[PDB]
């Protein structure tokens, strides 16, 4: 019944209140079968809604673009990449024509082309599409909106795949700046963006800068519960009488990361500490 704002370009404005009930049902079935990956049913029904809609309002209409966008994504999941790119451009052309060059639906379609090219390793081609979507999101939502930040994270990983590390660090820091000011410092996106930037640092050999971000994430996590963390204990075990001295999903990964890093550093007692603490945090 409900759908993410990220897939809004696959749905009719508001209800679709004035869309004939037949075309509304036909749309819901296309969506339903495509979810189950049952493309035998999904495609004809889509081709039919497309045919039915072209008769009613012509090819250059927002609803044609909607059914094209749905179909284009079915073709992409079928690994029919060239066909998918064609429909999305056709859908882009219509949306530019009927809704404006800087409409949210346009940004959505560009983010679909960029994803398609990127997942096919055509990062250079994807990059401007992603940047146009970002210039649209800025215009519409404002330069400090969390959705503008979400977009920066996608652009930064697109640039990372091209080794453009100076642009990457900038985008990740701009996105972290937004998620820290516009959202809480204990918002999950803050830790997510930090791990992403830490990954970039790792590529570059900046192990110490990544170690810092892992520690920062693990500190605000502990300080939320009881304002020493697992890593201070790890560093204590690394350095080292009647009885012995016996002893969030975005955090469990950070523990796997810092454990991996300590191991990379050859700090094995500190590594085992976090590696064991990660296995515990998973279960």
Swiss-Prot record:
It is found in: Cell projection, Growth cone; Cytoplasmic vesicle; Cytoplasm, Cytoskeleton. Its main location: other. It comes from the Eukaryota. The modification Phosphoserine is found at residue 248. GO terms for cellular component: cytoplasm; cytoplasmic vesicle; cytosol; growth cone; kinesin complex; membrane; microtubule. The keyword Repeat applies. The modification Phosphotyrosine is found at residue 246. The keyword Flavoprotein does not apply. Found in a variety of tissues. Mostly abundant in brain and spine. One of its GO terms (biological process) is microtubule-based movement. Keywords: Calcium, Cell adhesion, Cell projection, Coiled coil, Cytoplasm, Cytoplasmic vesicle, Cytoskeleton, Host-virus interaction, Microtubule, Motor protein, Phosphoprotein, Repeat, TPR repeat. TPR repeats lie at residues 23-56, 65-98, 107-140, 149-182, 191-224, 252-283. Phosphorylation at Ser-248 by ERK inhibits interaction with CLSTN1 and localization to cytoplasmic vesicles. One of its GO terms (molecular function) is cytoskeletal motor activity. Disulfide bonds: none annotated. Oligomeric complex composed of two heavy chains and two light chains. Interacts with SPAG9. Interacts with ATCAY; may link mitochondria to KLC1 and regulate mitochondria localization into neuron projections. Interacts (via TPR repeats) with TOR1A; the interaction associates TOR1A with the kinesin oligomeric complex. Interacts with BORCS5. Interacts with MAPK8IP3/JIP3 and NTRK2/TRKB; interaction with NTRK2/TRKB is mediated by MAPK8IP3/JIP3. Interacts with CLSTN1; phosphorylation at Ser-248 inhibits interaction with CLSTN1. (Microbial infection) Interacts with adenovirus hexon-interlacing protein; this interaction leads to capsid disruption at the nuclear pore complex during virus entry into host cell. Kinesin is a microtubule-associated force-producing protein that may play a role in organelle transport. The light chain may function in coupling of cargo to the heavy chain or in the modulation of its ATPase activity. This is Kinesin light chain 1. The gene is KLC1. The chain holds residues 203 to 495 of 573 of the full protein.
